[PDB]
């Protein structure tokens, strides 16, 4: 029976590939040949938020576009007031090895996780006046790569155990589990409508999930290496990826195939972070070579550089308002670019 | 008023400085090794789904943090980039067991890692007493698994433990030679390997780690001060 099922699998794969080939009657580069360039995007370090004792591994902006939570490997979360550099909170973590952090859309909670295989929800607004752990979500059999809030009640996380799960924070147990990746799930991005989310895995593929149906809708296999970062395009119909291949790819969910590749032969290091601009015309990307590059999402030609970091740029994000870009690095400093 | 928020930020900064004064005084060690080894016994003997396991011990009034990565997947390509900038990696192998080739491959993978090219390795060839018993019994020949042993001869620069069977010395030094050859043939200067023979009953592992870490930070400072 195994041989027959493998035959059927290869038949379906060939059919899918042929359909994608048939739908490729044009290219985004060909279509975008007429639009005017964006010129050169020069940005300068408006702020330098320092105080983390070790490598900064993750950061996330609040929906107010002013407060941002930052996580470091020494076991601290610091909620910064970016407008003034003030530190609102400094939360000591139980586990020093934190690899992700999130800021709830309402701003009431933050989450973090890492090699301890547990996602800890912290309650920022409490009568006692101090940040207190509200829930410790356990059940993953591997380190935690990413975590994003659908709401104050629900959080979706991805772990190195090749699984992604959706949690109900109130009861504290997995509502549903997503499976199918054959490697560590390294990044996770939530659709703007919060009905779908895409996760990249070390198996060099990205999958589109349905948070309520619990099944993958389609899979994308354009990369040749591990996918370290992923972000949705603002319209929600496309998403970009970053990999150890030292290149980015832009996939569209409706076309179900890659649209554009961003790479220069003079770049040889992997990509750690990715995020679009508010309009989506720019595609910032963090690199292991200590600097971040700005890519024109349509022309696909490099349009700038953000070089102010001493070490690896491990994290990066754009305000929902779109006024600024934050970039954390292993230098332990976090900088706001504008 | 915003001045109160500034004062709160200053208080948080003072707390962060008081925490940095503890962060910089602690030496962080990563404990690696296959399940057949005795790394669990080693960590237990440190008498001063959860994932990371941490053990703290003190020797000569310097604090050590020993992290054992218990519950993860078999592959470590990604989560090991976090353990960059640790003082040292404590690699443990069951020298009496042969699984030794898988241990050799694992040590080769750790040594030749992009993110661990400045991290010195402290190698504990654990369960040496079992190897000595195995050699004394002579039930199985190490040569079958490793053909090189048929022509290997113990060196003159050896430091044999008093009261040791010569064949045991040859076997243990050959096994040490495997790992030191792997280390020397692939990297130099940036990081070093410190082989050690040990047994679960031993109580000197803390002293071994302390001495090796002392030398490691000596070399780090020597590089920092442009003396090498």
């Amino acid at each position, epitope marked *: 029976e195994l041989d027959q099922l493998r035959q059927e699998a290869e038949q379906l794969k060939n059919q899918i590939r042929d359909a994608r080939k048939a739908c490729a009657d044009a290219t985004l580069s060909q279509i975008t040949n007429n639009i005017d360039p964006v010129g050169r995007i020069q940005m300068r370090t408006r702020r330098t938020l320092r105080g983390h004792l070790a490598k900064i591994y993750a950061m996330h902006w609040g929906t107010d576009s002013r407060l941002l939570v930052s996580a470091s490997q020494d076991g601290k979360l610091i909620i910064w007031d970016s407008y003034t550099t003030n530190k609102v909170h400094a939360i000591p973590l139980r586990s020093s090895w934190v690899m992700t952090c999130a800021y709830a859309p309402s701003g009431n909670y933050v989450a973090c996780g890492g090699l301890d295989n547990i996602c800890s929800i912290y309650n920022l607004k409490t009568r*006692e*006046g*101090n940040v207190r752990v509200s829930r410790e979500l356990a059940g993953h059999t591997g380190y935690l790569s990413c975590c994003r809030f659908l709401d104050d009640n629900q959080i979706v996380t991805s772990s190195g155990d090749t699984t992604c799960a959706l949690w109900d924070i109130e009861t504290g147990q997995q509502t549903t589990t997503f499976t199918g990746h054959t490697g560590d799930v390294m990044s996770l991005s939530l659709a703007p409508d919060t009905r779908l989310f895409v996760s990249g895995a070390c198996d060099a593929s990205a999958k589109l999930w349905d948070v309520r149906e619990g099944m993958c809708r389609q899979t994308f296999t354009g990369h040749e290496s591990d996918i370290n970062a992923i972000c949705f395009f603002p319209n929600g119909n496309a998403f970009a990826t970053g990999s150890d291949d030292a290149t980015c790819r832009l996939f569209d969910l409706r076309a179900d195939q890659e649209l554009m590749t961003y790479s220069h032969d003079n770049i040889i290091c992997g990509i750690t972070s990715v995020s679009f601009s508010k309009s989506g015309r720019l595609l910032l990307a963090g690199y292991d070579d200590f600097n971040c590059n700005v890519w024109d999402a349509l022309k696909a030609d490099r349009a700038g550089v953000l070089a102010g970091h001493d070490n690896r740029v491990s994290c990066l994000g754009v305000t929902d308002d779109g006024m600024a870009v934050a970039t954390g690095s292993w230098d332990s400093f976090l900088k706001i670019w504008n | 008023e915003d001045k*109160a928020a500034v*004062e709160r930020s200053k208080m948080i900064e003072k707390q962060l400085q008081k925490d940095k004064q503890v962060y910089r005084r602690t030496l962080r060690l990563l404990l690696l090794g296959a399940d057949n080894s005795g790394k669990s016994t080693i960590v237990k003997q440190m008498r001063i789904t959860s994932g990371i396991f941490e053990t703290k011990f003190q020797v000569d009034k310097v604090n050590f943090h020993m992290f054992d990565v218990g519950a993860q997947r078999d592959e470590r390509r990604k989560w090991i980039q976090c353990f960059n900038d640790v003082t040292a990696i404590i690699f443990v192998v069951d020298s009496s067991d042969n699984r030794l080739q898988e241990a050799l491959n694992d040590f080769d993978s750790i040594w030749n890692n992009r993110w661990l090219r400045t991290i010195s390795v402290i190698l504990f060839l654990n369960k040496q007493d079992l190897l000595a018993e195995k050699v004394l019994a002579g039930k199985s020949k190490i040569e079958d698994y490793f053909p090189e042993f048929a022509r290997y001869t113990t060196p003159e620069d050896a430091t044999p433990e008093p009261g040791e069977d010569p064949r045991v010395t040859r076997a243990k030094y050959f096994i040490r030679k495997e790992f030191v050859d792997i280390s020397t043939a692939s990297g130099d200067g940036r990081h070093i390997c410190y082989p050690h023979f040990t047994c679960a009953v031993d109580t000197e592992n803390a002293r071994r780690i302390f001495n090796d870490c002392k030398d490691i930070i000596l070399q780090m400072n020597l590089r920092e001060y442009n003396l090498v």
Partner: single-chain antibody
Amino acid sequence: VQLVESGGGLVQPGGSRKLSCSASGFAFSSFGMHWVRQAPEKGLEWVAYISSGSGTIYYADTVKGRFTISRDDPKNTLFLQMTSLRSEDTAMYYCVRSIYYYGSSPFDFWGQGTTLTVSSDIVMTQATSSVPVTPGESVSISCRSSKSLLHSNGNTYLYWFLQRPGQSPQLLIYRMSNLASGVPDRFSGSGSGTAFTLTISRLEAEDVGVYYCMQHLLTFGAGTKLEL
């Protein structure tokens, strides 16, 4: 969360007495504390303030140099020491909790208060002394300020408080638009930066009390007494 004061004994003019506050149920270390007095049958007046960590201390000119405020953070106790009590000092003294950071809601919780019986700054005015009302109808309370409380940061540092008969004041609105925790959505606030209005959409008998407006750019308004 509880703030209970102590003291309030009889004092002859020219005497001295120390009031104390015991804080429990919250992290007293990171809260700035205020002393707010209330003379018999009239409005509130701000007495003193000590920031978290005791880094900043302020007094009203009515008591500057005559009172002294101290906090014993390890024991979660706050003290107000008075050296020379005058007849003017007779008033009920509340202790008010306040934490300052972006988005916080200072002045949120007030203590129980104790009666101490003894034998230029911003001018905040509420012209209306009282307003007859009935349950189910909307009512508006207004106030004026000498300076425009709208700071260059965009925030309008105007606070509203309600004191029910026989209770300590409760925070309604902070910075002119933000409802405090536990306040029903029936209350709302607005202002132009120099004139402000507080509105209750639908009144209930539990809303009867005296409404005070305070600026934090700390003077209190004369108060408005809603009656039914």
